[PDB]
Amino acid sequence: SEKYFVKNGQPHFLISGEVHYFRINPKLWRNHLQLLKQTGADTVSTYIPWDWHEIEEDDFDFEGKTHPARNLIRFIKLCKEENLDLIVKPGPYILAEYENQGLPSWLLKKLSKNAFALDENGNVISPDLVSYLSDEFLEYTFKWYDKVMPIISKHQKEHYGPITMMQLCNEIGVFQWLSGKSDYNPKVINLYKEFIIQRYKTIEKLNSVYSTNYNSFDDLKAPSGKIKLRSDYCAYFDFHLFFREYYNKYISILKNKIRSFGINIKLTHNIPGWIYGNASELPMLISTYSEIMKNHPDIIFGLDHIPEFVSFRNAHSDLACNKILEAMQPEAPVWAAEFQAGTREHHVKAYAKDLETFYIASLAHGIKGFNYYMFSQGINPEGKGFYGKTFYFQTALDAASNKLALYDSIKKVNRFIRKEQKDLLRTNVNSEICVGFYKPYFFTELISSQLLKEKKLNVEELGLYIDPRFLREEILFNGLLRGLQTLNYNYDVVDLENCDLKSLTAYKQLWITSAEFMDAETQNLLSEFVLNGGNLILYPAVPTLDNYLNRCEILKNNFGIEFITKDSSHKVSAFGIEDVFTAFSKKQIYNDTNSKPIAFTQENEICGIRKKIGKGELTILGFAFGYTSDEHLELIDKLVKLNKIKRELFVSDKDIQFVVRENNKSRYIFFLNYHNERKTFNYRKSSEKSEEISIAPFSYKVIKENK
Amino acid sequence: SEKYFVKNGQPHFLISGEVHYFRINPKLWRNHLQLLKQTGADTVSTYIPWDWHEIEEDDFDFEGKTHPARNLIRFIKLCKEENLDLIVKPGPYILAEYENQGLPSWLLKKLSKNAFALDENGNVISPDLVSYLSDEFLEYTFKWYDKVMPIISKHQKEHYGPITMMQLCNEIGVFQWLSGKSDYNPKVINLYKEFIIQRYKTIEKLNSVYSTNYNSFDDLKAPSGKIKLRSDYCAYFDFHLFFREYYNKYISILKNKIRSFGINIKLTHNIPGWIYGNASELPMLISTYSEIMKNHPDIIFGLDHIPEFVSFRNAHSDLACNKILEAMQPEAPVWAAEFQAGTREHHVKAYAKDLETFYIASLAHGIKGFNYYMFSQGINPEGKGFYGKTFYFQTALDAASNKLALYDSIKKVNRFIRKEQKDLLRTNVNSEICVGFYKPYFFTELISSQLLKEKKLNVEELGLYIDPRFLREEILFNGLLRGLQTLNYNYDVVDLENCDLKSLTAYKQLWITSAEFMDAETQNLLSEFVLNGGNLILYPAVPTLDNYLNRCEILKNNFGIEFITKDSSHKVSAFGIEDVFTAFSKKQIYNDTNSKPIAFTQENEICGIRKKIGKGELTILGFAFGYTSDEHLELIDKLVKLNKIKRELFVSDKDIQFVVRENNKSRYIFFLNYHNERKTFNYRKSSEEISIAPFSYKVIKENK
Ligand SMILES: CO[C@@H]1O[C@H](CO)[C@@H](O)[C@H](O)[C@H]1O
Ligand SMILES: CO[C@@H]1O[C@H](CO)[C@@H](O)[C@H](O)[C@H]1O
Ligand SMILES: [Ca+2]
């Protein structure tokens, strides 16, 4: 049932370390590789920077002719000699705190303006930010691939070389996201027009969906400026759908090019989204890859985990992220393409004692492989550092190959993994709770995000009150998911798109955080779920619109719900819990028809009901809550207990996090203390003296049981 | 030298605990007060909520006639019996997560529209947000004072009673901050017009400053919307000055009313600005009280410190805030009116072991007193909480007076403070570095802040490239102040407004973080400073404009500086440090006649010089750096060493922070470990081997 890497037909935990040959004295390459191997790591990972190897236009060095550390060929040979497999990452973008994100200076000086990402005014957004489908950009990228790809092809595992995997480019859209502006390049605009014409066929059909009055497709322009009408929302929704096809076109072109060199190894891509040590926006960025993941079953996405510290302030980010990757990529192992080791920034410390706990928590949280980023510190040669001379701090090795404090933490974690990987990789958590991932709520990177310079989406101007970004960040990511993890209830996340009823009916409960809009397909799937025997928890709104904000009352009518939206105090009572603070004055007030009222406004109006519908159960709460008070954890606990869901352990300290993982042979108990307190507690299995445990601040214990 | 509270004619560390009688079972009031006194606390602090006591219009309950927890009189008698002094805070605003921010529901229902703060369209901003100078609001505020102030007068220290201090209202302007919305109430706008007429006298004078085309003051509208033109920046700048006068008018009306009751005790106000565990915006909030602090030497401002956690991620916030308060309030002790104890937010943990370190670091960082907020948890009466039933978590005591983990930390820190206060309170750090506080850069709460989401200020539309909030947050607060503290170099901050030349001449170096604009008085002050023998460090720009963005090149011409602004790579070299990352492509390239070039672009153009001017020295860098690389610490260290400034100790571990505090007799060395690492290190001056746990401290005393 588990998805894991396999080596020689056996479960294999992928343990990689990032070692940048181009930032290490080549006389010390072998020492870095040997010391990585000695931690039990099986793989090494590096970028191959285009700027580093195409030293001038059409002048290539991969053999150290012009600089010893340009000898890629010798680095590849050393990996094979030191029995490490190799992950190569030739870009064209590498980011990697490298000048111009890895693109050659000579290229950026030569490209015309139309090669660059442009704002709504036609101005260059950033001097190192290209437009991905720029003709000029792809012509130069292809000429770079013509030189680096024959080397990668020759050194593949199938030809007895060390190369097992290759990353295509780096965090597609990360540069656009961090710039705070979207790409209005004329290639984007023209491709968008073709997309719209293919989608709608006639202007009359587009006008009927948008409620616009265009005479022809020629009158329609890519949406710019703030959303003031539902028709602007519709245009931006289609723009989001278009950018997912656009990123799929980019990675398809790179992949087709690469395959033409006889490169048959596993292709990877890496998911950005952590910033300031939390990952609440990563679900938005992963959502931009929806069409790539649908179209390329042979590209494995891995996470870029950058926690920076390990405390209750960010404990939920890594689990939520691992769960959402699983939902969008159910057929591949969850793994971290970049797994924080040291710090990319001197002023943002990375303590070995934090990261060691992160590594263990990641195993508890179901990670199946990772690449320590950065295992080895680098020193940038020849002024190539974006931000300074030194690349990373507080790593496993310094640039000179000296062991630092983190080395012994990685050796300890890797030792446990190698001893246990045969069983541990095959273990599952018993999740009786499924949480719905409704991708369209995440499609706002053009209009609403933590990074976007201009807020383009104000839902109040559309006569709505439930902002999809507020819902998915505060009600879902920081709310329900944070709540369930804190309460030690296992959950899975399932992508609702083309979702199998069969793959929902194994859960005791399905939880749906709903806005006022939801497509007909999803409204029909949730209806069938309940009619057929499913138990559904749905808040803060019964939706009544589709993704284009047109009438769609399928779920409301199938559930026999009548409601009015009324203004009241933020506080409600729910299941006998008084003074539950809710996010909105407006709430859904339900008729008590064929239902039990279980939530009341300050005027005792019904804002939550429970009902039996066909063979199923429905609980609706017409109010929004995340986790910003103790009442919210009480409410989540009450809702879970409606279907008699029990934690796996009784633990005497509610602030201790645990995960039980098991298969037929083995049970692993992970205890995680995310708090600055030495905690002494006792526990027992919820079905039969209690064991006592002492756990340091920001620390962990792992217990293995045979059977 | 030092400013400190006094008790029995000796230095007194003010140790207060916040205990909300109105949120606590009255049967347990005496228990709470006894457990607070048993920590060594000398004072207890509480709101007196207007909503809680004026239960209906003109119906007052201070004796528990209608609810036992409305017996304020009995709470005051218990403070007296348990030998605690009392800080009272009657509002009218209390915030304190209290419904309507403490204003009666009956008041908010009955006020006219024109009593409320209005957006530019004349719409009510928030149904609990009144206009501070609303006639109706002040009428009802005065009637609340008429009942609560005679009780406070009767029990005040000037009549021997337990009440030693009173806070006026609560965090004035905190609602214009949190929303970014200014009050456009017609009475406010009429006051803004009076301010402008009074300031410029004639429309011709104002037109010449703003470059506007008005025929009269009748044509003048309050600024709104985004700044597109230099004339809009000018109008918004005076709108900022106006709000500083407005808040001084409000707090003066409250103060005159209070004094009319014969209340002669110390009056207080509290400074907001921490959010998400850092305080980089608090300097903006303190700048809103510039006119109050100028005109009321008798009102003591205290800080509201909410660190949430204690690490290198926020180590610099509390010191920078304490140093800025000292700059703006040199004649009163630096203290925390609200000093984090527990957490306002269940999901935002406050570890006893973090706050214990924060408490000791605060002593290192010059705090002279504090009020643990919240010492006691509260239970909101009858749904009167803004949020849920419970007020604060992980406090010293829960609402039922159960001791929690923080209690023992507070008792430990208080025992240390009581043992040392006599000598500790009279100690200062030896600062050879002075950092200038130029308040106009901070006057942006209406146009540019962490809490305004739609920014009205885009300096590129004005032909500028150095944004004053970016400068004061990233180059000053998180850059230079963070770097000096990390390097363990003492600094003082000085308010440049009406600044005495003599109070700059004690320092070996004055550091000025400058945008492209600076008023004639500050340009003149800095010119004189260097000519008379001062050492000035100035970056990232020689200013060429005044606060109205009109030409002003006093400093530039007095120092014989010429430059062109040119685009280059972000990285420069400076004092032989290669690859210094700078904020801007645009840099000042200096004519090097009679100068030494000390910084270079990637094309080797001169973006920094040193120069002798009269008896003094000038170091100008035409590029902006904060602290985002090891080269930035190397550059700060090189700059400090230009005038041979030394740290007080050699400590073997660079990541240990220390503060040396001395007077003639006593030295305290505070070692602070802001890192998740047990650190062993040794130290010696400029048995010497020491171990400190993660996120922990050690204090060493040396007799001199
Ligand atoms: C500039 O580097 C990028 O920064 C983002 C914001 O922290 C991260 O989400 C990405 O994983 C990282 O590659
Ligand atoms: C709403 O409560 C206020 O919140 C601000 C934002 O965190 C703080 O700066 C203030 O001190 C606090 O009183
Ligand atoms: Ca000159």
Tell me the layout of helices and strands.
The structure is a homodimer.
Chain A: E1 6-7, E2 10-11, E3 14-18, H1 29-37, E4 43-47, H2 50-53, E5 54-56, E6 59-60, H3 72-81, E7 85-89, H4 105-110, H5 135-154, E8 163-167, H6 174-179, H7 186-200, H8 203-210, H9 230-259, E9 266-271, H10 282-287, H11 290-295, E10 299-305, H12 315-328, E11 336-340, H13 352-364, E12 369-373, E13 378-379, E14 390-391, H14 405-424, E15 433-437, H15 468-486, E16 491-495, E17 509-514, H16 520-531, E18 535-540, H17 554-558, E19 563-567, E20 571-574, E21 577-581, E22 586-590, E23 596-600, E24 606-613, E25 616-621, H18 630-641, E26 649-651, E27 657-662, E28 666-673, E29 679-685, E30 691-695, E31 699-706
Parallel strand pairs in A: 3-4, 3-12, 4-7, 7-8, 8-9, 9-10, 10-11, 11-12, 15-16, 15-17, 17-18, 18-25
Antiparallel strand pairs in A: 1-2, 5-6, 13-14, 19-22, 20-21, 20-23, 23-24, 24-25, 26-29, 27-28, 28-31, 29-30
The structure holds methyl beta-D-glucopyranoside (2 copies) and calcium ion.
CATH-defined fold name of the largest domain in chain A: TIM Barrel
Identify the overall geometry of chain A: globular
Coarse structural class of chain A: alpha/beta
- The total tally of domains of chain A equals 3
Pfam families (chain A): GLMA_2nd, Glyco_hydro_35
Main location (chain A): cytoplasm
Binding site for beta-D-glucose 2 (chain A): 353, 356, 699-700
Active site (chain A): 171 (proton donor/acceptor), 338 (nucleophile)
Short description, anyone?
Chain A: Beta-D-glucose 1 binds at residues 171, 273-274, 344. Two copies of one chain form a homodimer. With 707 residues, chain A is of the alpha/beta class.
